[PDB]
Design a protein around this ligand. Structure first.
Ligand SMILES: [K+]
Ligand SMILES: [K+]
Ligand SMILES: [K+]
Ligand SMILES: [K+]
Ligand SMILES: [K+]
Ligand SMILES: [K+]
Ligand SMILES: [K+]
Ligand SMILES: [K+]
Ligand SMILES: [K+]
Ligand SMILES: [K+]
Ligand SMILES: [K+]
Ligand SMILES: [K+]
Ligand SMILES: [K+]
Ligand SMILES: [Mg+2]
Ligand SMILES: [Mg+2]
Ligand SMILES: [Mg+2]
Ligand SMILES: [Mg+2]
Ligand SMILES: [Mg+2]
Ligand SMILES: [Mg+2]
Ligand SMILES: [Mg+2]
Ligand SMILES: [Mg+2]
Ligand SMILES: [Mg+2]
Ligand SMILES: [Mg+2]
Ligand SMILES: [Mg+2]
Ligand SMILES: [Mg+2]
Ligand SMILES: [Mg+2]
Ligand SMILES: [Mg+2]
Ligand SMILES: [Mg+2]
Ligand SMILES: [Mg+2]
Ligand SMILES: [Mg+2]
Ligand SMILES: [Mg+2]
Ligand SMILES: [Mg+2]
Ligand SMILES: [Mg+2]
Ligand SMILES: [Mg+2]
Ligand SMILES: [Mg+2]
Ligand SMILES: [Mg+2]
Ligand SMILES: [Mg+2]
Ligand SMILES: [Mg+2]
Ligand SMILES: [Mg+2]
Ligand SMILES: [Mg+2]
Ligand SMILES: [Mg+2]
Ligand SMILES: [Mg+2]
Ligand SMILES: [Mg+2]
Ligand SMILES: [Mg+2]
Ligand SMILES: [Mg+2]
Ligand SMILES: [Mg+2]
Ligand SMILES: [Mg+2]
Ligand SMILES: [Mg+2]
Ligand SMILES: [Mg+2]
Ligand SMILES: [Mg+2]
Ligand SMILES: [Mg+2]
Ligand SMILES: [Mg+2]
Ligand SMILES: [Mg+2]
Ligand SMILES: [Mg+2]
Ligand SMILES: [Mg+2]
Ligand SMILES: [Mg+2]
Ligand SMILES: [Mg+2]
Lengths: 191, 80, 166, 148, 15, 107, 95, 140, 97
RNA sequence: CUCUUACUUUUAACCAGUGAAAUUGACCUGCCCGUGAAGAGGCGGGCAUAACACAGCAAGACGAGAAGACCCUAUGGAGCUUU
RNA sequence: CUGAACUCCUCACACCCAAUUGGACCAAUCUAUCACCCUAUAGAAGAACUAAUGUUAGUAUAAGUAACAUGAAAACAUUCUC
RNA sequence: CCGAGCCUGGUGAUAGCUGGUUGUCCAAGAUAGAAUCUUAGUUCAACUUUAAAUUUGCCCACAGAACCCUCUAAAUCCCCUU
RNA sequence: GCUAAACCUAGCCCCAAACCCACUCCACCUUACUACCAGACAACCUUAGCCAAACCAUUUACCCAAAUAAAGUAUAGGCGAUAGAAAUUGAAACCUGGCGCAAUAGAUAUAGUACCGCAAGGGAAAGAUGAAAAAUUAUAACCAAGCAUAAUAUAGCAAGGACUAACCCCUAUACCUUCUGCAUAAUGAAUUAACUAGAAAUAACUUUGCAAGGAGAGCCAAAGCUAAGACCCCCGAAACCAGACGA
């Protein structure tokens, strides 16, 4: 929801074309009294309380909270025997059928999330096997998120990725309160 | 047209019931309907009445000559 | 709009067995979009309801209403339709089983009134439905007699129980 | 919403309106409680207990001169120059337990706080930073990114 | 007691 | 409603209980789903409860058809020919155990 | 009161409250007496003595004055040599 | 997102099914039937007090009639059966007068016997002992 | 009347297409990226709504000062009228004061 | 006018054709006395009472029609006059 | 003796005040993920109508009522009456 | 429908005034008064609701609360115990 | 059994991106759409008022060239209602998407047409087979009110309790609104379908996170701080002002 923008919008009685003239005199006709033909009570009139988009739903959880949800997802995957550590994502062949028969023999699951350290150092073997599959997706370690971990049943991490995650997630557990954004120069950051 | 599926599905069920009442189907044997095991239904028959029936005998108490004669007619047509 | 009345002459019954009784023939016919009121036409369809084909044609032949000449035309063409298409041997061996009127698709015109006022008048239309059945007209039900009234009253006196007890 | 009136129709009078009689916030005379509040100088207090607590944890080293920058870098104080803050005032709370030899620079200091620092062999000096310099001394890095 | 008169209102012809 | 509904007099089936008592419940047909949260309570009733319920009622034939379904139902058939259909949708095991037993007690 | 301004979209402050009242950080509001400069020649010294005293306001008044002011006037200030510095905190208060 | 009621048909049919047996337009038009269905349910809820009341009125009328056949009045039968420790309610008494007439005459003779013993005791000053049917069984 | 007589066409959804399979990726670009980027910068849409939230009066006021000089005359006039109506409702009408 | 009457035409009613409008909470829509938001077809106590069209009448339905134009209220309007 | 929704008896129990206030559930719709004769857990919202002399459309009531219309005969040529 | 025309727009004019205000179920719940161009309204108090903290609240024994004065009033206030 | 019912497309909305911008011939400022004759007329100028202030009379926010922050601060003001900066600070930016509508919706739009008005101006309604209609004696039926099939039998808000039994017996003063109080002869409603009405700050409460620190510069802080959740309707005057159109 933090990146949701609703584009729905309706027109009020002030935005519907026409509707400036009083339909008929206030008294005498024996009919109900109306001021415009575009009021909500009318057919073709404005919407009293409708969407007034574009509307944003932006909000931010505290950094320490968002970093803690990753720890829980990584912990739940291991406790439920859904986490698998690798040394390298290099396949013998770029055949997508091999990666599928390999996840069924080891009984991984119907969906697998492959996490590599960087996007440029990804072996071409695994890049050619996951580009043609739908449930075997490959992301870099920087793109790890609770939603994709929960959608996929099995999680696969490489050894470099493990060290990468521990460094980033444990830095929140021991850090000062920010004087200025962490994107600016600091004494010991990054590394 | 209103969007949704629950009300349309629920309305089709009422139409079926209405159709059955207007045109009720002919009755059929319970064995033809689903969820039937003759051997299990005949054991309960005895236990239900608290009697120590003999299955071999009780199964022949429900077999009638008319059914035997017709059962043969079905085989003759098929040569079995 | 619905046109089910014309589809009733297309049902085909299975051949009857030798012991079964002769089945009477049923002939459905109608006329659509008649420039006439269904309320005025109802009095004509109620008249011949239950009559014979030849008696109904005689009552409609000397009636002054406009609907009479229209129904009589529908009966004459249903009579011929029966013997020609529905295997009816005698054209006089028919009686009016069902006869009613229905509302048709009507138009709307403006009727002017005084003081710049106006009304909305409708050019009325109607349908006429008739069903012919082979055979003589069923005998009318005799009026209830005193013996039946007394026989029914004593039957109510014998069906009464002791209420609100054992 | 209730029944009729201004309550149900949403036409209540403004906040403070008492129905017509001179309101409470208007029948009271005016006095200069907050006259010139935006031009008064403020100083975030720094107690000797706080300072000694920062030194015992290593967040502020007494081996080098202690100035306003080192205090901020150690999260010892939080200066708000935009809120008419002019620095820190060294207060005397925790003078008895204070035991540290430091060279601290503070914009204000009490007579007793000075004695506690000069008793242990330290030096305390008072210096003035204007609002512009005060923002630079507290956050130098954001200032070095301006090319000034 | 001002003279109060309501003028007739015709409806759309197409109806 | 009374005036908007029908009525009957108190009665029994074949003078039941006069010479001997005969259980009128004759058949029970469950329709549970292997997958589906609606059938969670029905699956646990089939694992521990239904087997012990059949031991006590040997005159009732119980059928458990596990198939895809969004609303699990239990159909009870009685000697007199009556058929009562009921839904166990999103019901706990304790709620299904008191319902099935009610069906066994009825005529 | 202006709950949403037309330029910033935020709540405004009533400046008639700022020129008459003082808010202590604890939540108390201090005021003057109505008529401490009016017709002193017909009033007694006892009445004049309690007319030039700074008094507190009640719960209903203080809740209103807090709604008529923004959060900037409720912050903790550290003015230099403030005469009301000691009154911004309560001591030995229960319940 | 525009949401509309898609199942308004079923919402009104659970009201009209209780109005099918009404008369007039309040058996098919929701606006009219809802106000008469709501009155029917209230009448049915308050009728549970009248049913119990009218039953006891019916029993008493039948007991009164069965007691006059034996020359007794309702108060003399009910009041004197309680004095004989016989706790039979109106429902049972009315059932006995219809289906067990020989037992109801025995109960009326008992009440008439206990009634006559009460008069005899009212003429004495306590010296004479209590009647045979006037004795009371004690429960400790 | 008011309810369809037939069932609608089935609603087939692919739960494993590109947009659903890769939803949520790069939401922690800051935590895991040394805070070079902020997640709000991944939001696309109106330039006056990126990484910002408000009510209709706040949204309308913000749109008028950010893209109001590029708006069509009729749309701008309606925006100003909407701001006037909302100014009166929020500041003068309601149950609470 | 006392004091009305007769005839003709229109209307009228009947047959045929065409075919509006205001109105309408639902109605299985009686009388007397009493009661009651103080004037009851609908409540209480009594009386009356098979069903049904057509033509007439105008006592009632506080009958229809127009959110009373008289009167008062609104920190509601407007026209005119003025030291 | 009759006589209540008072009280007892058998069983059960949150299950009879306007405005106002607090709380427990929920129809349908969309989205995420399940499910797969129609559901589940959550997130969202143009999210529920026996009443505004309400808006539009349909059809009744009044009512087959009010009201409307074509000079005559004949050979349809023509003539007659006004 | 000229005590001052019509159309469009400002305009969703304003209305302390009338009318209307859409699913289920349970619960608590009737109020001294002051000010006000104010008495067809509002604000404060009082009553009422929810959450929290704490300790007393209700009922009430003696003793005790005015002279001036016409009803030598029914009563109240205070109040441990219970 | 009639009348009807039902449908999914037409297109539309909000963004993004990109600046935008004609043509056959002939005719058209005179009475426009009229081939062809003596002329000289020329453009610029503070908006007001409704409303708020519970009247009203000074006054009462209206993009004006960078998001944030400084700050609703300085300051202005029947010092009332309310109005309201700057210095300074300094961010991001990949059109081809949608927890948007689906024929009373969404553009008024099938069209600014039909129609109304002298004129300015106002301003609609609606469609639905199938692969094939060069398969049209075709695409089944079942559903609103309204009628028909099928008028009616003492007595009464029309039902409920019931009953062998429809009625007969017993019990029962329609609904909403508005009121001290309505069966009231007080208001509204012929009926069916669809459409038609509670929008948010301050503080506080509840549930997480971290903790003398909290927060993804700004701000708060003598257990606080961050985040989330959860409270504020609809229709209606007579009027006022500006600019056009009309003898
Ligand atoms: K407000
Ligand atoms: K005469
Ligand atoms: K009359
Ligand atoms: K009248
Ligand atoms: K009223
Ligand atoms: K008022
Ligand atoms: K005014
Ligand atoms: K339209
Ligand atoms: K009244
Ligand atoms: K009236
Ligand atoms: K009325
Ligand atoms: K009403
Ligand atoms: K002229
Ligand atoms: Mg407008
Ligand atoms: Mg208006
Ligand atoms: Mg619209
Ligand atoms: Mg005319
Ligand atoms: Mg109201
Ligand atoms: Mg009031
Ligand atoms: Mg006629
Ligand atoms: Mg009326
Ligand atoms: Mg009377
Ligand atoms: Mg008559
Ligand atoms: Mg007359
Ligand atoms: Mg009036
Ligand atoms: Mg005025
Ligand atoms: Mg005015
Ligand atoms: Mg009793
Ligand atoms: Mg009780
Ligand atoms: Mg109880
Ligand atoms: Mg559900
Ligand atoms: Mg849900
Ligand atoms: Mg709604
Ligand atoms: Mg409706
Ligand atoms: Mg309505
Ligand atoms: Mg008439
Ligand atoms: Mg006539
Ligand atoms: Mg004529
Ligand atoms: Mg208004
Ligand atoms: Mg209660
Ligand atoms: Mg005054
Ligand atoms: Mg008052
Ligand atoms: Mg006490
Ligand atoms: Mg004003
Ligand atoms: Mg600036
Ligand atoms: Mg449209
Ligand atoms: Mg119908
Ligand atoms: Mg009666
Ligand atoms: Mg209502
Ligand atoms: Mg009154
Ligand atoms: Mg009453
Ligand atoms: Mg009446
Ligand atoms: Mg009135
Ligand atoms: Mg809100
Ligand atoms: Mg003016
Ligand atoms: Mg003018
Ligand atoms: Mg002229």
């Amino acid at each position: 929801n933090f990146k949701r923008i609703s584009y729905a919008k309706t027109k009020t009685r002030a935005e519907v074309r026409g509707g400036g003239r009083k339909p008929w005199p206030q008294k005498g006709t024996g009919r109900a009294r109306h001021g415009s033909i575009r009021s909500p009570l009318w057919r073709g009139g404005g919407v009293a309380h409708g969407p007034r988009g574009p509307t944003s739903y932006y909000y931010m959880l505290p950094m320490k909270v968002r970093a803690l949800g990753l720890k829980v997802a990584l912990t739940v995957k291991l406790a439920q025997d859904d986490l698998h550590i690798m040394d390298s994502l290099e396949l013998p062949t770029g055949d997508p059928q091999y990666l599928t028969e390999l996840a069924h023999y080891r009984r991984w699951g119907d969906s697998v999330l492959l996490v590599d350290l960087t996007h440029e150092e990804m072996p071409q073997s695994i890049v050619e096997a996951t580009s043609r599959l739908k449930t075997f997706n490959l992301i870099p370690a920087v793109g790890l998120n609770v939603h994709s971990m929960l959608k996929h049943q099995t999680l696969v991490l490489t050894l470099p990725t493990v060290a990468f995650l521990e460094d980033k997630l444990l830095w929140q557990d021991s850090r000062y309160r920010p004087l200025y954004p962490f994107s600016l120069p600091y004494s010991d950051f990054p590394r | 047209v209103k969007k949704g599926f629950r009300a349309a599905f629920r309305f089709q069920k009422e139409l079926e019931r209405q159709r059955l009442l207007r045109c009720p189907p002919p009755p059929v044997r319970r064995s033809e309907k689903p969820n039937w095991d003759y051997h299990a239904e005949i054991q309960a028959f005895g236990h239900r009445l608290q009697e120590n029936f003999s299955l071999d005998l009780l199964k022949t108490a429900f077999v009638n000559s008319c059914y035997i004669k017709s059962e043969e007619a079905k085989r003759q047509q098929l040569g079995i | 709009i619905s046109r089910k009345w014309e589809k009733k002459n297309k049902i085909v019954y299975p051949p009857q067995l030798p012991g079964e009784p002769r089945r009477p023939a049923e002939i459905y016919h109608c006329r659509r979009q008649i420039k006439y009121s269904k309320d005025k036409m109802w009095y004509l369809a109620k008249l011949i309801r239950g009559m014979s084909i030849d008696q109904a044609l005689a009552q409609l032949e000397f009636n002054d209403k406009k609907g009479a000449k229209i129904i009589k035309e529908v009966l004459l063409e249903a009579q011929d339709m029966a013997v020609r298409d529905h295997n009816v041997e005698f054209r006089s061996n028919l009686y009016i089983a069902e006869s009613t009127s229905g509302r048709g698709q009507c138009l709307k015109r403006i009727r002017y009134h005084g003081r710049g006022r106006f009304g909305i008048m409708e050019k009325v239309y109607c349908h006429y439905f008739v069903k012919l059945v082979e055979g003589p007209p069923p005998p009318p039900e005799p009026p209830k007699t005193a013996v039946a009234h007394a026989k029914e009253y004593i039957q109510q006196l014998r069906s009464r129980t002791i209420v609100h007890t054992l | 919403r209730g029944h009729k009136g201004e309550r149900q129709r949403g036409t209540r009078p403004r906040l403070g309106f008492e129905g017509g009689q001179t309101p409470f916030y208007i029948r009271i005379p005016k006095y200069g409680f907050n006259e010139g509040h935006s031009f008064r100088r403020q100083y975030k207090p720094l107690s000797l207990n706080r300072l000694q607590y920062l030194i015992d944890l290593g967040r502020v080293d007494p081996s080098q001169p202690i100035d306003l920058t080192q205090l901020v870098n150690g999260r010892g104080v939080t200066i708000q120059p935009l809120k008419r803050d002019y620095g820190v005032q060294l207060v005397e709370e925790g003078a008895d337990t204070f035991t540290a030899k430091v060279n601290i620079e503070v914009q204000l200091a009490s007579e007793l706080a000075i004695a506690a620092i000069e008793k242990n062999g330290g030096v305390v000096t008072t210096a003035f930073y204007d609002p512009r310099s005060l923002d630079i001394v507290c956050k130098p890095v954001p200032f070095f990114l301006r090319g000034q | 007691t001002k003279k109060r008169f309501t003028p007739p209102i015709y409806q759309p012809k197409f109806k | 409603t009374a005036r908007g509904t029908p009525s009957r007099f108190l009665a029994s089936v074949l003078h039941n209980g006069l010479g001997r008592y005969v259980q009128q419940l004759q058949r029970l047909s469950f329709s549970v789903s292997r997958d589906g949260a609606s059938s969670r309570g029905a699956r646990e009733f089939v694992e521990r409860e239904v087997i012990d319920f059949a031991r006590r009622n040997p005159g009732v034939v119980i059928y458990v058809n596990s198939r895809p379904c969004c609303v699990p139902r239990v159909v009870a058939e009685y000697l007199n020919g009556a058929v009562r259909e009921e839904s166990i949708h999103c019901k706990s095991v304790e709620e299904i155990s008191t319902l099935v037993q009610k069906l066994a007690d009825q005529s | 009161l202006t709950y949403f301004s037309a330029r910033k979209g935020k709540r405004k402050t009533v400046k008639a409250v700022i020129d008459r009242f003082l808010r202590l950080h604890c939540g108390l509001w201090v005021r003057r007496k109505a008529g401490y400069k009016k017709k002193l020649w017909k009033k007694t010294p006892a009445r004049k003595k309690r007319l030039r005293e700074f008094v507190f306001c009640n719960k209903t008044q203080s809740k209103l004055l807090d709604k008529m002011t923004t959060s900037f006037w409720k912050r903790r200030n550290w003015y230099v040599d403030d005469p009301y510095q000691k009154y911004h905190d309560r001591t030995n208060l229960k319940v | 997102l525009r949401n509309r009621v898609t199942d308004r048909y079923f919402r009104i049919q659970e009201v009209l099914k209780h109005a099918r047996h009404f008369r007039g337009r309040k058996n098919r038009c929701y606006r009219l039937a809802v106000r008469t269905v709501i009155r029917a349910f209230v009448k049915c809820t308050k009728a549970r007090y009248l049913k119990k009341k009218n039953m006891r009125t019916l029993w008493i009328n039948r007991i009164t009639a069965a007691s006059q056949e034996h020359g007794l009045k309702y108060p003399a039968l009910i009041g004197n059966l309680v004095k004989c420790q016989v706790e039979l309610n109106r429902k049972v008494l009315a059932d006995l007068a219809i289906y067990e007439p020989k037992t109801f005459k025995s109960l009326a003779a008992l009440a008439s016997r206990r009634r006559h013993e009460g008069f005899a005791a009212a003429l004495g000053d306590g010296k004479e002992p209590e009647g045979i049917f006037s004795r009371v069984v004690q429960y400790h | 009347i008011g309810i369809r007589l037939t069932l609608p066409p089935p609603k087939v959804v692919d739960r494993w297409n590109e947009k659903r399979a890769m939803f949520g990726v790069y939401d922690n670009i800051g935590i895991l990226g040394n805070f070079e980027k902020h997640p709000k910068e991944l939001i696309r849409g109106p330039i006056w709504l990126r990484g910002w939230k408000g009510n209709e009066l706040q949204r309308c006021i913000r749109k008028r000062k950010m893209v109001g000089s590029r708006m069509f005359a009729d749309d701008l006039h309606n925006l100003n009228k909407r701001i006037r109506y909302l100014y009166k409702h929020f500041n003068r009408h309601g149950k609470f004061r």
